[PDB]
């Protein structure tokens, strides 16, 4: 902990399906929301998850 913040510690907040036990994913890409093709833009409901 640090005053002003300590931001080393991220976490996935958005994914596709339910992850199975005891594997991981470091596939840092865009996130896609709906029926729009964003696929690596942002702003209009795209993300970094």
């Amino acid at each position, epitope marked *: *902990s*640090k*005053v*002003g913040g300590n931001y080393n510690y991220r976490y996935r907040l958005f994914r596709k399906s339910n992850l199975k036990p005891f594997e991981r994913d470091i596939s840092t890409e865009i996130y896609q929301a709906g029926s729009k093709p964003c696929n690596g833009v942002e702003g209009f409901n795209c993300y970094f998850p």
Partner: antibody
Amino acid sequence: VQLVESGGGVVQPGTSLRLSCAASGFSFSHYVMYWVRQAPGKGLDWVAIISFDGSSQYYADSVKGRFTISRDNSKDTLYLQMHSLRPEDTAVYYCAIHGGTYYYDKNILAWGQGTLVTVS
Amino acid sequence: IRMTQSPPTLSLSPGERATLSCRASQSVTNYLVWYQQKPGQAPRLLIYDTFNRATGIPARFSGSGSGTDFTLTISSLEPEDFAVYYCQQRSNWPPTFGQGTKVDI
């Protein structure tokens, strides 16, 4: 555990004063310390905190900007460095221990015995 | 996150039992400590973390309570144990002490 504080007396409104807190017994590093004032005829209220090395110091109201707390475990003491004071924070001051940094740190708490500062 | 001690001064004789309540502005768990400050002394701590008192404090001092409401109980102290009492939290930064409750006769 033991705590001995020093740097009390009478000053003028607009001088400085070395507020020092010496610790022994328990290991002075791995441990979070802080200060607490009490104006005579009041309750209890805190001053400033330091986190086991100088990377993060939090402050209270109306003492931010006149108070620079620093610790140094290579000479195992604590400082407030009251600086350019007011004629209204005449009080008694105590250095106390918040406690704990790792999992094996066995949190115990202890207090000093007071340091009196007065103004003119 | 501000503490408060709502019972004011009391007039319990050397005997009987006393029960002192401390609240909190939000959820604090097993993080309180009690202090008993005489007229003009250092505030001596009483109770580690809501349940176990420290060394040199007898068994008639007991500390309990949970959630956001905490209680210190004197079973049958003695003919002196009249001072002011404080509840302090060590959840986060920094440790707020509250208001305080005296006792008289």
